[PDB]
Amino acid sequence: MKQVCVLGNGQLGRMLRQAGEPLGIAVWPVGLDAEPAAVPFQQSVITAEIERWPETALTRQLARHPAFVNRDVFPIIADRLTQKQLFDKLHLPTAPWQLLAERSEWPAVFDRLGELAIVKRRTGGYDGRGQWRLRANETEQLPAECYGECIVEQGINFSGEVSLVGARGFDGSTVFYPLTHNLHQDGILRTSVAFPQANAQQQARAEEMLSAIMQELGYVGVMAMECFVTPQGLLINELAPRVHNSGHWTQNGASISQFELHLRAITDLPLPQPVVNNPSVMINLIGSDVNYDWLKLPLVHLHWYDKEVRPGRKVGHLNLTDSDTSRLTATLEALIPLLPPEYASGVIWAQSKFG
Amino acid sequence: MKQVCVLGNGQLGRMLRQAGEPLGIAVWPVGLDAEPAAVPFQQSVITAEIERWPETALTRQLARHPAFVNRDVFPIIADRLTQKQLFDKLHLPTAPWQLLAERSEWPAVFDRLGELAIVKRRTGGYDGRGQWRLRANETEQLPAECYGECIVEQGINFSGEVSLVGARGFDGSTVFYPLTHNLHQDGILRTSVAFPQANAQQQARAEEMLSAIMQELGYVGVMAMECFVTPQGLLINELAPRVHNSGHWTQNGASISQFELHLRAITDLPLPQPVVNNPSVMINLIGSDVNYDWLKLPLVHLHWYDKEVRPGRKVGHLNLTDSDTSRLTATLEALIPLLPPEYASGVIWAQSKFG
Ligand SMILES: Nc1ncnc2c1ncn2[C@@H]1O[C@H](COP(=O)(O)OP(=O)(O)OP(=O)(O)O)[C@@H](O)[C@H]1O
Ligand SMILES: Nc1ncnc2c1ncn2[C@@H]1O[C@H](COP(=O)(O)OP(=O)(O)OP(=O)(O)O)[C@@H](O)[C@H]1O
Ligand SMILES: [Mg+2]
Ligand SMILES: [Mg+2]
Ligand SMILES: [Mg+2]
Ligand SMILES: [Mg+2]
Known part of the structure; x- marks a missing residue:
């Protein structure tokens, strides 16, 4: 039963652990301040949900670990200057x-x-x-x-924002989900909407870019590329060397979630193309307490992070998927009165994606 | 906030715990030999995935425990003599x-x-x-x-077996899944197939019967009723006062799984009718080692129990769901050479459901 340790103690690691379990893969999220002596890092493949960190007894131990996947890629992506230079090198917009x-x-x-x-x-x-x-x-x-x-x-005055999440296998194979539409307000992601078939041109442009990057970096696992949609095509905004908030809809709207996909990649298991047949919406829960009334709506999948609720903090997300977009819009409409006011804008923006 | 202890240490408890996590419900499976001093019984809702048990330091604490939902139904159900009589007292075939x-x-x-x-x-x-x-x-x-x-x-010479999985809430409301077709060989369930719409007459007879049952008992939570199909209609075979193997498909084929539904019921959370739009197939894994090649097929959802592989033991299950039955049939076909011989019969039987 494979063992994986994830550096970092946030919701991302938790979701990776939840995904790993039914696949027979034990995943151990380890914070930076963890005691290495307690960590089964020796018998594990190491991954991370963070890209930079201070030096600790835990990180010093990790340092010398043979199997810390992508270890060397993080610093390049962690510094915006070096990341931007990477796009320049590869001729990416x-x-x-x-x-x-x-x-x-x-x-x-x-x-x-x-x-x-x-x-x-x-x-x-x-x-x-x-x-x-x-x-x-x-x-x-x-x-x-x-x-x-x-x-x-x-x-950049883009008409919209989209991200491409996909993965690269140790043998170079790559697989992608359809592009996801993202809404950000006050710098934080609020809502994502994904369709089974994206603008075919945008989809190919993105895949070619992400592919060139993962290859150049020799990266293995899931990476997300955030882009801006302009009349000249997409521009890459930034990359996340890991599972990403924009792809949470995949937990319920793809046959293989971004979390399962990352674990498949890093443990060298099969990486076929996830199947995505219907659209999906994800509403981020930020600084709000859980309201179980949300559960009155049967299509709503609650993903609660068990984090302390504080302003501006991501506390969970709600996913909904269905082949009937009317149902989705209706579910959305029913959610408005069940969410704080600041959520209306994103919920309505999601509805409009199906209009 | 949600704390649930589940009496019993098997895969059903593990799946209840995986389901409760994202809902913000902390689930603790407790084996019969567990040390009561290590269990949060006092601050929890208590449920069970077993129905009869010896007296141990642990079960002694559960006797008459007010937080143990359905504590008095277990014994009624656990004895086939008492169970049969229930049917009898309610005029159920x-x-x-x-x-x-x-x-x-x-x-x-x-x-x-x-x-x-x-x-x-x-x-x-x-x-x-x-x-x-x-x-x-x-x-x-x-x-x-x-x-x-x-x-x-x-x-009974039945034409087939079907089970009805549903739940009853503390206020008497009930919800159900469409009937599931089950195939048993050598006494053990090997495969199940669910369709979004089951024979209408059949479904109604089952729902009426199960509702009568749960209401008669004051039962709260998920219950399963296995029945035999005969020309005079359904005959009830037996009941399981808990989530049941034939309902595992609901983990990926319904908007609310039977694990989630059970936790909702017992914690007094909302209980809307789960959405089921496409058919699902579940193949039970019995006494076989995990074979990661199953993962080359994207529709396959692996649910491995982390149990020692022994002959005749349930070690996991594979779920597949899609609106396109031809896809399911193709996935099944591809599965045959990836499973031990004894699985062909069941897979073919599933395929046959879509023929
Ligand atoms: N050059 C740009 N022009 C216009 N808008 C921009 C530009 N750069 C960023 N933004 C807007 O700001 C949002 C957040 O910016 P960005 O991803 O760089 O920051 P961040 O702090 O790395 O956010 P995170 O890692 O949480 O995604 C972008 O998704 C976009 O809405
Ligand atoms: N009276 C009966 N007539 C014909 N077949 C029967 C009868 N009772 C049981 N069977 C067959 O045996 C199977 C298992 O029987 P039953 O459910 O009573 O056993 P069990 O040991 O309680 O199994 P489990 O608890 O694992 O479902 C039934 O699903 C059916 O295939
Ligand atoms: Mg960003
Ligand atoms: Mg960023
Ligand atoms: Mg039975
Ligand atoms: Mg039985």
Whole structure:
């Protein structure tokens, strides 16, 4: 019975453990502060749900582990500069950008990028923290700390956002789910909607890009590529070297979930193409307490994280899938009065995807 | 918040625990020999995946425990003599029978029940162990121990077997799954097939019968009723006061699984009718080692129990569901060479359901 250890103690690891169980794979999520002595890392394949970390007794032990899959890929992706350079190397479309070295460069930056600059911390950002959207007369708001520690990109006016989640096997095979439509508000993902068949052109463009990246990196497991939809085609925004929030719908809307797919990849099990026959919606639960009334609606799949509820925190997600989009829209409509007000916008945006 | 302890350490408990996690319900399977001092009985709803048990430090604590849902139904069900009588008291069709008290009753038993008698141990039987099929000149095979400890009933020539899995809530509401077709060989269930819409007359007869049963008992949770199909309609074979093997398909083929439904009922959560839109097939894994090649087929959902593989032991099950029956048939066909010989019969029988 394969053993896998996942570095990091969040919901991602928990979902990987839940997926592993019925497949006969024991998965052990280990936080950074864990005691290595307690960790069966020796008899396990190591994976992670994080991409960067401080040095601890646990991480020092891991360091010397032969089977930490993708170990060397993380730092490249963990630093936005190196990630952006990777797209450049591979000729992949992405927002024009540059390292933002010091105050003095501002003039050349706007000259280069346009009216709106999007400044991003090279490492550690998530949910939009560590991101600034500045105009020529607003540069003084950027913390000095940021000089040398941030990249700056052109503000992209996309018509929508989509991510491609897929996986690469140790033998180079790759498999993908259809593109997923993502809605972000205030920097955090709120809702995702996936259809069995995406714009065929967009789907091929994305697969070619993701494929080139996984190959170049020699990556094994699941990776998510977030892109921006523009009239010239997609632009890659960023990558996540792991299972990703946008693909949670796969737990209930694909024959093989992103969690199962990642475990198959890393343990070298078969990686056939997951079957996706119907559309799916996923609503993220953020800073809200669980309301079991949601369970009155039979299509709603509750995925609760057993995390402390605090503002802005991802606490769970709700998935719904059905071959009849009317049912989905109706389920959505019934959910509105059962969710806090800030959820209406995303729920309605999901409904409109079927309109 | 949800804390449930389940009496019994088998795969059913494990599947209840996997189901409860994402719902935010912490499920603790407790074996009979467990140390009561290590169990959260005081802060939980108690359920069980077994129906009769010896007195141990652990079960002693469960006697009369107010949090143990259905505690008094178990014993009624656990004895076939009491179970049969229930049917009788509710005018529900069942096989003509009687308590088999002693050797001398034999000639009259055959005069009354006809050619073939089915002897069954009053308690503890499963997978056909404790059952004997006898003609009038074979009674000497029945161990002497049986007299007074087994019932005897009419061998029924049924055209097929179907089970009804459903639940009853604390307020009397009930919900059910469509009937499932079950195939038993050598006393053990090998395969099940469910269709979204079952014979209407049949489904209604089953629901009326099971509702009468659960209501009569004040039962809360999931119960399964195995029946035999005959030209006068269904005959009830036996009941399982819990989630049941023939309902495993609901893990992937219904919007709410029988595991989830049981936890909903017992925790007083909502109990809407689960959605079932496509057919499902479940192949029981018995005494065989896991074969990861099964995973090359994308529709296959592996549910491995993490049990030691021994002859005749249920080690797992494979579920498959899709709206396209031709897909299911093709997946079944591909499964044959990937399973031991003894599985062909069952797989073919499933395929035949779609023929
Ligand atoms: N150049 C850009 N132009 C316009 N919008 C942008 C741009 N970069 C980011 N955004 C918007 O901000 C959202 C969050 O940005 P991004 O993914 O870089 O940050 P993050 O902190 O890494 O978020 P996370 O890791 O949680 O996805 C994007 O999905 C998009 O809505
Ligand atoms: N009276 C009967 N007539 C004909 N066949 C019968 C009869 N009783 C049982 N059988 C056959 O034997 C099977 C198993 O019998 P039964 O369910 O009573 O046994 P069990 O040991 O309680 O099995 P389990 O608890 O594992 O379902 C039935 O599903 C059916 O195939
Ligand atoms: Mg990011
Ligand atoms: Mg992002
Ligand atoms: Mg039985
Ligand atoms: Mg039975």
